[PDB]
Coordinates of C-alpha atoms and ligand atoms in Angstrom, one line a residue:
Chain A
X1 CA 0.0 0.0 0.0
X2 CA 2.1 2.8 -1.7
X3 CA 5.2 1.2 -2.4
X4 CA 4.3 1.2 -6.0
X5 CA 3.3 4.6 -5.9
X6 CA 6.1 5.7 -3.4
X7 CA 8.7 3.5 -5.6
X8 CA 6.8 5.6 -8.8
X9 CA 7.1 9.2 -6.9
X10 CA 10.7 8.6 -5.4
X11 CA 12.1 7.5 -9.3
X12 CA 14.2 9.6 -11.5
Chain B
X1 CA -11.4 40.7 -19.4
X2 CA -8.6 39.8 -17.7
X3 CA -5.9 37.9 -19.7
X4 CA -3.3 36.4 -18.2
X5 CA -0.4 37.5 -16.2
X6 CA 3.7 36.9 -16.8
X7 CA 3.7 34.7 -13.6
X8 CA 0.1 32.8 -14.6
X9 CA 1.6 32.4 -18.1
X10 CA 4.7 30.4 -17.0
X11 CA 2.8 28.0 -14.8
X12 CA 0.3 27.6 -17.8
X13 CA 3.5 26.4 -20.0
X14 CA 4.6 24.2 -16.5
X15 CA 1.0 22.6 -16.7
X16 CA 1.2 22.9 -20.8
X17 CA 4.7 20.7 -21.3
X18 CA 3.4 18.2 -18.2
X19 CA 0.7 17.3 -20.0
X20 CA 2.0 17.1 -23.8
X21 CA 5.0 15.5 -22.1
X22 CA 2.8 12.6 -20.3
X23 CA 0.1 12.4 -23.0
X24 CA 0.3 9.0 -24.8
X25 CA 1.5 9.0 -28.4
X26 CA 1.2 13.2 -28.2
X27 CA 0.0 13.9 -31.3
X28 CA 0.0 10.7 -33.3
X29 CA -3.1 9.2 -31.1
X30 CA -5.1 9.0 -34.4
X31 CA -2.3 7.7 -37.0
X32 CA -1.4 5.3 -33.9
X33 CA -5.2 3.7 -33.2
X34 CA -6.2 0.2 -33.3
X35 CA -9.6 -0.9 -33.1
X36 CA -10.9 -3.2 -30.8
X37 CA -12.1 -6.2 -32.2
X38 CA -16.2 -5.8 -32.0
X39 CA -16.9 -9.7 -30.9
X40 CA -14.6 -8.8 -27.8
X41 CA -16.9 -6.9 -25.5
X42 CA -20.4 -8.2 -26.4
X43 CA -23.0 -9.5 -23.7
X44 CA -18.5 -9.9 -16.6
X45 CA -16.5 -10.7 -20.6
X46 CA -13.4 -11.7 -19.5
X47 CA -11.6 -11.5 -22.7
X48 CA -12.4 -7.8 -22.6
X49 CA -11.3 -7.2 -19.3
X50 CA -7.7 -9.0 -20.2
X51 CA -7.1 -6.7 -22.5
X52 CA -8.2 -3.7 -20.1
X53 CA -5.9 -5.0 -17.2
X54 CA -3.1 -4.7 -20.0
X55 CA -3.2 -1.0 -20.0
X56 CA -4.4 0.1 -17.3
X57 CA -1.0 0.6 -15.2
X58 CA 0.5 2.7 -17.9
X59 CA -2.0 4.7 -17.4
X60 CA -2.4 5.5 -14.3
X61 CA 1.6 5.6 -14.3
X62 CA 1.2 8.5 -16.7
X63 CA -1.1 10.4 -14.6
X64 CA 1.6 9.9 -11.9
X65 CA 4.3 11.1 -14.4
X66 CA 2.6 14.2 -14.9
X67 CA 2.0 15.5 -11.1
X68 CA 5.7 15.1 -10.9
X69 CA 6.6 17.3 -13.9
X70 CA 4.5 20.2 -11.4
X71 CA 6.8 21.8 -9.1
X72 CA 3.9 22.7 -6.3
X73 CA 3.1 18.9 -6.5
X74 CA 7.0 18.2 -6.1
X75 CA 7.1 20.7 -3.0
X76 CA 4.3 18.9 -0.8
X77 CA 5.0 15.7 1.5
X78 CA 4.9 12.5 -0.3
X79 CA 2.1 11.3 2.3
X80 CA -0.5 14.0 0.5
X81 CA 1.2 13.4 -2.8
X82 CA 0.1 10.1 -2.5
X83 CA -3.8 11.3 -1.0
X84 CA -3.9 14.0 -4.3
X85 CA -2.8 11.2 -6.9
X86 CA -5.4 8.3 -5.2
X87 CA -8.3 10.9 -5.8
X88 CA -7.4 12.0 -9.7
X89 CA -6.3 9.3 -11.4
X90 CA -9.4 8.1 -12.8
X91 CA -10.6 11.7 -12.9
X92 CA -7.7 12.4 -15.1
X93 CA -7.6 9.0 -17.4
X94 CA -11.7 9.6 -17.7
X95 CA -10.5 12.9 -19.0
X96 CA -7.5 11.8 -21.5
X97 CA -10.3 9.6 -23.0
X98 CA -12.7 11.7 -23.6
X99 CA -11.0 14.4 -25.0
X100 CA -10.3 11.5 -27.7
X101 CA -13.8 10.9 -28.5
X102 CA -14.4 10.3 -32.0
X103 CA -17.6 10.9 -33.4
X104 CA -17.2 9.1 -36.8
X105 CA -16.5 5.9 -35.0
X106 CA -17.7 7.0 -31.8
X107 CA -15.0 5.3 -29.9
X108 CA -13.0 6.7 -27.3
X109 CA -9.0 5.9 -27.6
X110 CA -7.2 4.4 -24.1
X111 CA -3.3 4.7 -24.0
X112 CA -3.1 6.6 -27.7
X113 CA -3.5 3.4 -29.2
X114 CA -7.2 1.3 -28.3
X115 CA -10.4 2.7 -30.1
X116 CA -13.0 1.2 -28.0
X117 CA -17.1 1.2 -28.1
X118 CA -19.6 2.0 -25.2
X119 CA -20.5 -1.5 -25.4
X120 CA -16.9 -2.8 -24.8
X121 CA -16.2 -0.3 -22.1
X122 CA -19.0 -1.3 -20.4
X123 CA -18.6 -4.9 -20.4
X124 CA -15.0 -5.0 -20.1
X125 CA -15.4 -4.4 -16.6
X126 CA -16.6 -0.6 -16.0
X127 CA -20.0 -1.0 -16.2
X128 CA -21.7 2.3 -16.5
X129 CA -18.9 4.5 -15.9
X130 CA -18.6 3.9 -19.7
X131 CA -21.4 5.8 -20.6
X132 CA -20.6 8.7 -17.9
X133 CA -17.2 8.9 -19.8
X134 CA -18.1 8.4 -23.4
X135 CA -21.4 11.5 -22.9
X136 CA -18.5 14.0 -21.1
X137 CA -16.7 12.8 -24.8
X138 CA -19.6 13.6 -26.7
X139 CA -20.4 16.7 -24.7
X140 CA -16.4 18.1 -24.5
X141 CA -16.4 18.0 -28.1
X142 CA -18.2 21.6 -28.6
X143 CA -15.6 22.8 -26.3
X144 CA -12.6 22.7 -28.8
X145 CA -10.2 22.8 -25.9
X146 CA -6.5 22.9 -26.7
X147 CA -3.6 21.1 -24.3
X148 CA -3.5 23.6 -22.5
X149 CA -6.7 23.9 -21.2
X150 CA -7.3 19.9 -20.7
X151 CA -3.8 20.6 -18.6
X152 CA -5.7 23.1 -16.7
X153 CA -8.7 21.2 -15.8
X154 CA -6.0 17.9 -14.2
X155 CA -4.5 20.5 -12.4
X156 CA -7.7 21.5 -10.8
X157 CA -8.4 17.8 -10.1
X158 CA -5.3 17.1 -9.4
X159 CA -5.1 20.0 -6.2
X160 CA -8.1 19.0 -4.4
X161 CA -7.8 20.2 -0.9
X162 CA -10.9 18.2 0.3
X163 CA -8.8 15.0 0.0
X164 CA -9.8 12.4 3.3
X165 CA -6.5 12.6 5.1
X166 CA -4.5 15.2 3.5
X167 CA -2.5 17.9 5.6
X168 CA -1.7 20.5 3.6
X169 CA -5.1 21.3 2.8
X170 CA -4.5 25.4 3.0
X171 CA -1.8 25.0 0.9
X172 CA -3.7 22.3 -1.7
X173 CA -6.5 25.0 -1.8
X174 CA -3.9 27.8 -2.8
X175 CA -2.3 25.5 -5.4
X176 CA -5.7 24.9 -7.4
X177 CA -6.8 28.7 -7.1
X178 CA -3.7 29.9 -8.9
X179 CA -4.4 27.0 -11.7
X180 CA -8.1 28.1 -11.9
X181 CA -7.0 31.9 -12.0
X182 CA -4.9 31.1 -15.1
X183 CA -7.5 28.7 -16.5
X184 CA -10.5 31.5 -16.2
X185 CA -7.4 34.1 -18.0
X186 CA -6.3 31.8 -20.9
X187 CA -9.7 31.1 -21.8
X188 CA -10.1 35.3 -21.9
X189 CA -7.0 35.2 -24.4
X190 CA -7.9 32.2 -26.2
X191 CA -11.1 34.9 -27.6
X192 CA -13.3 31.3 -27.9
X193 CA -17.1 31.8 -29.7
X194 CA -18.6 30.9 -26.5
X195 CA -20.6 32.9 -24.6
X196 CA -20.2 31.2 -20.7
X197 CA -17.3 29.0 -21.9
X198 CA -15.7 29.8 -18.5
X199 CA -18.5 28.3 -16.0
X200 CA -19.4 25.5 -18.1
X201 CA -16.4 23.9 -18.7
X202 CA -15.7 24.3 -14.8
X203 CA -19.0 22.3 -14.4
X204 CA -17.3 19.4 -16.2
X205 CA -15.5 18.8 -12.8
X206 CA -18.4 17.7 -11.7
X207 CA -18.8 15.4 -14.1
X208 CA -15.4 14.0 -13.9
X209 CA -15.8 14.1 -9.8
X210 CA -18.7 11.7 -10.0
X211 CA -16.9 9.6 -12.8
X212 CA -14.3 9.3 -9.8
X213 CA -16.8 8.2 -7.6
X214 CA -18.7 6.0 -9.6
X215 CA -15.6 4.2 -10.3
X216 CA -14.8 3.7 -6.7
X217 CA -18.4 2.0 -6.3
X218 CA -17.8 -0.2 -9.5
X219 CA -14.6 -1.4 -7.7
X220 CA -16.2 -3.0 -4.9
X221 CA -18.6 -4.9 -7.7
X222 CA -15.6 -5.6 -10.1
X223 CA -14.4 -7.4 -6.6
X224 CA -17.6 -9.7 -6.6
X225 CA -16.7 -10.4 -9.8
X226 CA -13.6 -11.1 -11.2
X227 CA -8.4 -10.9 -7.0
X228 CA -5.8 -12.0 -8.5
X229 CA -6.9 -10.5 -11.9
X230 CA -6.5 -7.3 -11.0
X231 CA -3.0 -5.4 -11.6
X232 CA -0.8 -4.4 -8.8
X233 CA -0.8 -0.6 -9.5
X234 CA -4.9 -0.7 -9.6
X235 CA -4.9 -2.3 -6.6
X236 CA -2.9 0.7 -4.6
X237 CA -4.6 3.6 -6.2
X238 CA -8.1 2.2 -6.2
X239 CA -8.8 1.2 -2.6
X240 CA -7.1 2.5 1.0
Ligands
LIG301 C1 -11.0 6.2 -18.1 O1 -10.6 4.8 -17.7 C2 -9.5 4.3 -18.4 N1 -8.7 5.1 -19.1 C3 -7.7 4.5 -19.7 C4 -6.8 5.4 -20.5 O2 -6.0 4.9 -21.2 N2 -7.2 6.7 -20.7 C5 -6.7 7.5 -21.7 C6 -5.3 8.1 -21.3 O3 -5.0 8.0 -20.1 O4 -4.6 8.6 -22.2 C7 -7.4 3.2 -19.6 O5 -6.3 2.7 -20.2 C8 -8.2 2.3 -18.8 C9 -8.0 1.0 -18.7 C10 -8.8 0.2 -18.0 C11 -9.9 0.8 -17.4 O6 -10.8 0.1 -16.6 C12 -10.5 -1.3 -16.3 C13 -11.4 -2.3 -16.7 C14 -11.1 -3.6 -16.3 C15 -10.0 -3.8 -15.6 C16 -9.1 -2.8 -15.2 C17 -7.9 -3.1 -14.4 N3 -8.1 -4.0 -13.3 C18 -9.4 -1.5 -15.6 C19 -10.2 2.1 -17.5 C20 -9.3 2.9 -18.2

């Protein structure tokens, strides 16, 4: 629950 | 009246190039479109919904893509980056369609490269959000609007201060104002043959707002349906 979207906010 | 200012006019090329820059296939959607067969989504169809579960990450991965390419998104905490994201992503993708309505072939195009029907839509999994989305489509079509202004209008969804749980709500609230301030001026400039162009697109929110909410409804009976199905990314943004 929010990795994916911490992982997808944290990138580049 | 009021066009826009120097300030207003750099944040509406920040929102501008987010968008474009996010957009799938830019400007190539129509060259780039592939009809969806018509015997896949008759009448739930789970051949349909295979090849919705196919693009629906990149999709909401795009939506993610262009928060971040928005500085005042980039300055909040990650916990109400996360709330703001949850609440627009189908707003935004509901959007991205619709603005890619086609009359001739009344289809609406997912990730700049499905033409789908109502019909498939709606039996692909999403029910009778389809026909909330595919009517914004046929009614956004009068509208004419450029990037720019679909930019706009995600930006307003996007900075929603009335997130559940979010803590920067003052802040949220001042975000979104500025973005509506140099919405209401750019459609000034833009000189459009529209009497009221201003107030009724904003009304659209509405529409897209219940879309969102609709959806969120749907997911609870796509879950009485069809677990395991469902993409990871889905999963996250659609439930808590
Ligand atoms: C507006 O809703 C949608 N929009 C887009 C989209 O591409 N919008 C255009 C753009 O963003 O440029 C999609 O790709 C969608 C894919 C599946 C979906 O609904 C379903 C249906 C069945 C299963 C699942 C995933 N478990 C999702 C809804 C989509």
């Amino acid at each position: 629950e929010n990795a994916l979207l911490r992982y997808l906010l944290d990138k580049d | 009246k009021p066009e826009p200012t120097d300030e207003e006019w750099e944040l509406i090329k920040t929102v501008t190039e987010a968008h474009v820059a996010t957009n799938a296939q830019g400007s190539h959607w129509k060259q780039k479109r592939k009809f969806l067969p018509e015997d896949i989504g008759q009448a739930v169809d789970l051949e349909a919904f295979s090849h919705f579960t196919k693009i629906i990450t990149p999709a909401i991965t795009r939506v993610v893509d262009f928060a971040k390419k928005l500085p005042m998104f980039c300055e909040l905490p990650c916990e109400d980056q996360i709330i703001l994201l949850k609440g627009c992503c189908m707003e935004i993708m509901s959007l991205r369609a619709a603005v890619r309505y086609d009359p001739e072939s009344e289809t609406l195009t997912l990730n700049g490269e499905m033409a789908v029907t109502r019909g498939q839509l709606k039996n692909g999994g999403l029910g009778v959000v389809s026909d909330a989305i595919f009517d914004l489509g046929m009614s956004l079509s009068s509208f004419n609007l450029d990037d720019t202004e679909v930019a706009l209008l995600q930006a307003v969804l996007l900075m929603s201060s009335d997130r559940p749980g979010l803590a920067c709500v003052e802040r949220i609230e001042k975000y979104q104002d500025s973005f509506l301030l140099a919405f209401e001026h750019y459609i000034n400039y833009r000189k459009h043959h529209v009497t009221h162009f201003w107030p009724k697109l904003l009304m659209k929110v509405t529409d897209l707002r219940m879309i969102g909410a609709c959806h969120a409804s749907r997911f609870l009976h796509m879950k009485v349906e069809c677990t395991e199905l469902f993409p990871p990314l889905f999963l996250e943004v659609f439930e808590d």
